[PDB]
Each structure stands twice: as C-alpha cells, then as structure tokens.
Amino acid sequence: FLELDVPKADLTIKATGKQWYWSYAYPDNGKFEFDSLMAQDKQPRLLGVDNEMVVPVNKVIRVQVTGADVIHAFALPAFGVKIDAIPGRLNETWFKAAKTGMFYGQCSELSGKDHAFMPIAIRVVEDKEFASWVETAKKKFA
C-alpha cells in the first residue's frame, strides 16, 4: 500500500472477539458467519482451528473488528495488522496477502492467563479456491 492512499477493499470481513474465540462474518459473500475455535482430535496436526478465516491472495481485505464483551487485540504481524476490537465500536484496517498458505497469531510478550488464548488463523488461497470455498461456506454456515 502507498500510505497516502485510501485503501479500497476487494473484500470485507468482520471479526468479533469474545471470551475466548473469534467469530468471522462475510458481508460481501452472503452474510454467513462462523466461530473459530481451537481444533482438537485433528491428529497428526499440531496447530490450528476448526474454521479458518479464509481470503484470496493479492486482494485488498478490509477487516472490521468489534468486541462482544471486553476489548480483545486482533494481530497478525505478517500482514502488518494490529487493531483493537472494542465493544460498541467498529474499528477497521486493510491488508493484502502476497503469499498463499496459513498464518497464525502470537501470544503477546506479556505472560497472560488461563483458557484466554484466542487463536487467529488466516488461510490465504488462490481466486478459484476462494470462489469455491465461498460456495461451500454459504451452505455450511447457513
């Protein structure tokens, strides 16, 4: 991005944080929504969630975030994203993925407490794969 430009989203996703998971809504792709919880009994995988935030590569993504209950931080260093999800407020930023694959968030450098880890999992795919994923998600998360 040129910093002086107003970014123009190809796609918008709305991330809602709650104790203790993210939920993602796709207003441009049929308004479906889903919760993203830490996966389990997906051996031999070691990381990740049941339902990832999926996006197309090389497109400008607007991410609007809000908090359901308290303030949660939504951060993904590889995309330069670091924004607070505040109850009663819709905050936004924009990013663009240049590579396909999986992107997982971090714990903050502060030791934090107690079932409170909320994983962020973003999956970047190509155009055809995104279109197809959307069609399936429309049915699955209706």
């Binding site: 995988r45 070691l46 990381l47 951060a75 993904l76 260093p77 590889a78 590579k99 396909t100 694959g101 999986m102 992107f103 997982y104 968030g105 971090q106 714990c107 903050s108 450098e109 030791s111 934090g112 880890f117 994983p119 970047v124």
Partner: protein, 175 residues
Amino acid sequence: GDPACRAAVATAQKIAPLAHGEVAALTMASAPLKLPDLAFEDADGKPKKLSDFRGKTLLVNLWATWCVPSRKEMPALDELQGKLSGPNFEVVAINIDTRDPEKPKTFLKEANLTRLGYFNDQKAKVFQDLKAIGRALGMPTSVLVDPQGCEIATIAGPAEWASEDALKLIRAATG
C-alpha cells in the same frame, strides 16, 4: 548492514518462493542483519552463545510454557530436528520461562521430546535482544540463521515446522 551477511540475503531471495503453505508467514531478510550473540544455558546449566553454533544453518526458536502456540509447535520442531539435523543444520529452541525452572523440562519429558536438548534463558533476555532489532513481537518467534550468524528469515508466529513445506524450505536453505 554487515557485509558478511549478504550471502544470507542471497539465500533468502533464492528460497523465498518456498516460503508458503504451512510456512507462509516467514518473512525473508532483504537486508544483511547479523543477529545478536544470544546467551543462554544448556540442560546442564553450562553457558552457551549463538556463535558456538557457527558453521551450520540454524532454526532458533523462543518458547515458553505459558504460551500455548509455542508449546504446541514443540513436537514439530523436535521432529524437524530428527529429520534434518546434521553437519549443516540444527534446531536451537530456547525456553524463556522466568519462574519454576523445572516446569519446562517436565513439559518436554511429558511430551516425550528428546531431540531438542534443553536450552534455556531464565532471564528471557534473548527475547529482549531480538526485540531490539525488531525481531520479536510476540511468542513464539523463530529465526532462520545462516552459518555466519546472519538472518535468513523470521517468523512471528507458530508453524507446522515438520510439514513438507517446512522441510523443503529448510533443505533449500541448507545444502
């Protein structure tokens, strides 16, 4: 810039196209950066430094029992050590817990991870050292380091470090 670190940049450019899939979040070095000479102990409490590992490509990871994603990827790093360690590569995972020196060893013993040794910095200063050069925003953090102690790439997050994507990238980086 340290002119000794250009070859590391050349490797990062060369392997950039492999930094995808399970290891997509790796950020390739695009300028020569000599890492700080991190100081830590081994399982016997003997003093170690990053420079003691010169001559090999390394994956340096910082992990802690209080960070869930850093705990979770530990078996991948142990499996990666198993598959690829040798004359030209080693995984150096440094625990940075600052209370209860024994909880991390217990974690590794209970997960039955025996290939990583037990490098530790109970001061967690290694985190502050990488943070200063803009290479530690959170936990876990891992850095791919060339035989000269120079940055090849850094990832600010966990990854499936024994996946095919990870393996192919490391082999490309090595030899």
